[PDB]
């Protein structure tokens, strides 16, 4: 995932709600204490390489129980029987 320049660690993950070519995006955020904070924001669409068609991935978390569910993951946009054989974890950490 990108981080910000200033603290090199990730923070928080919000979605643009205004309006606009990038509405509906994801981005990451500081979430420091007061004291300490940056005005740097990044696309969390970078964290997503592309995939075997050609196109980006997009994020998706697990569900299942066990030791792997809440971590997230990235696949392809494109629905079940169009997917490509491409899948990579996230940083859970």
Same mark, same amino acid.
């Given at each position: 995932s990108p981080l910000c320049k200033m603290h090199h660690r990730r923070c928080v993950l919000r979605v643009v709600r205004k309006d606009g070519e990038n509405k509906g995006r994801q981005f990451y955020a500081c979430s420091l204490p007061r004291g300490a904070q940056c005005g740097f924001f990044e696309w969390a669409d970078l964290s997503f390489p592309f995939c075997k068609h050609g196109k980006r991935s997009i994020m998706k978390t697990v569900l299942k129980i066990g030791p792997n569910n809440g971590k997230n993951f990235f696949v392809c946009p494109? %629905?079940?029987?169009?997917?490509?054989?491409?899948?990579?974890?996230? %940083?859970?950490?």
């Open positions: 494109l %629905e079940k029987e169009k997917q490509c054989n491409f899948f990579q974890w996230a %940083e859970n950490g």
